[PDB]
Design a binder for this molecule. Structure first.
Ligand SMILES: Cc1nc2cc(OCc3ccc4ccccc4n3)ccc2s1
Ligand code: NI
Ligand code: NI
Length: 330
């Protein structure tokens, strides 16, 4: 498809963006929701970046270019879209703050960028779909199909004229940050998560875990990328349930495509199977989210508010199964 260069009229306002006061305190929190501030996201990011690695961290004329160009390359799909990008990036920021001195500037800015870019050019179709129905990309990338494409897009965007914001770095620092990013994105493939989790859990429970160990570091950033990518399970109940609607909207659309070629899709992608959602969420929390956050608590205790919320949301889902489900406005 190629990459589309953003029009020059969008960054014309962003360079002038000043952050409202009341948010300056609110942003710092884990459960904070970007939702209500759509027209502020491009600034919310900048602010987070300026706070975590200083004002002169990037060439602001090119950072503003990089962002609004990334914004364009997210499709108007119902979930894996521009809003997801910022939501995830914010959770990174939040983690990074509560663990600031554990990471290099290179790492901090590297991650923040990777987060906003982790789902670039998402078509609203999973790995399973692209691999079971030989999409060109699956033979391009046998494993972690979409994630690899996400990376190449990020790369291509940087390579375009007036985009490279890591240019002010040494060719040694460039090789590393693009790698920190490479690994960061690839880890967001849930496939790799479970293995990664167990390892980290084993390592910790045996005191093996050391963050000066480049291999252990990779894995800790790994679980970070997973924690953030799924942080919708860490927001207050009502947001959690609305975001959930966005995901199924996208899931079912894919299911609509597997029906059009004689394969009954997994219940999760079948709009005719809504009844199974609350039980289906229980599973995902118990098998994935709780593990993800419990582990991350042990490794990084200041992240514990993420787990506190997730346990609450599971507690809410159990309460939905029992029939105590509360009001919703559709
Ligand atoms: C932010 C994300 N939420 C989820 C939830 C998932 O699970 C939802 C799920 C699971 C099993 C089901 C079985 C039947 C019906 C619906 C289901 N939904 C799977 C991946 C992600 S990423
Ligand atoms: Ni993804
Ligand atoms: Ni994602």
């Amino acid at each position: 498809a190629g990459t589309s260069i953003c029009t020059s009229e969008e960054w014309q306002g962003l360079m002038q963006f000043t952050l409202p006061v009341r948010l300056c305190k609110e942003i710092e929190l884990f459960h904070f929701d970007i939702g209500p501030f759509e027209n502020m996201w491009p600034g919310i990011f900048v602010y987070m970046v300026h706070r975590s690695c200083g004002t002169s961290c990037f060439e602001l004329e090119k950072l503003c270019r990089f962002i609004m160009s990334v914004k364009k390359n997210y499709r108007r799909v119902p979930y894996h879209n521009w809003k997801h990008a910022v939501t995830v990036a914010h959770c990174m920021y939040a983690i990074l703050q509560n663990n600031h001195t554990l990471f290099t500037d290179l790492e901090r800015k590297g991650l923040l960028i990777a987060c906003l870019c982790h789902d670039l050019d998402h078509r609203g179709f999973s790995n399973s779909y692209l691999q079971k129905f030989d999409h060109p990309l699956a033979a391009l990338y046998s494993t972690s199909t979409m994630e690899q494409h996400h990376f190449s897009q990020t790369v291509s965007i940087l390579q375009l004229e007036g985009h490279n914001i890591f240019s002010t770095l040494s060719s040694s620092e460039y090789e590393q940050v693009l790698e920190i990013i490479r690994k960061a994105i690839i880890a967001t493939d849930l496939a790799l998560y479970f293995g990664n989790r167990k390892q980290l859990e084993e390592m910790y429970q045996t005191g093996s875990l050391n963050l000066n160990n480049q291999s252990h570091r990779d894995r800790v950033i790994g679980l970070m990328m997973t924690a953030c990518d799924l942080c919708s399970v860490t927001k207050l109940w009502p947001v959690t349930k609305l975001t959930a609607n966005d995901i199924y909207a996208e899931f079912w659309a894919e299911g609509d495509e597997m029906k059009k070629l004689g394969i009954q899709p997994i219940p999760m992608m079948d709009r005719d199977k809504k009844d199974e959602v609350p039980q289906g969420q229980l599973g995902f929390y118990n098998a994935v989210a709780i593990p993800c956050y419990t582990t991350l608590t042990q490794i990084l205790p200041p992240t514990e508010p993420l787990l506190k919320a997730c346990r609450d949301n599971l507690s809410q889902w159990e309460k939905v199964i029992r029939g105590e489900e509360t009001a919703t406005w559709i």
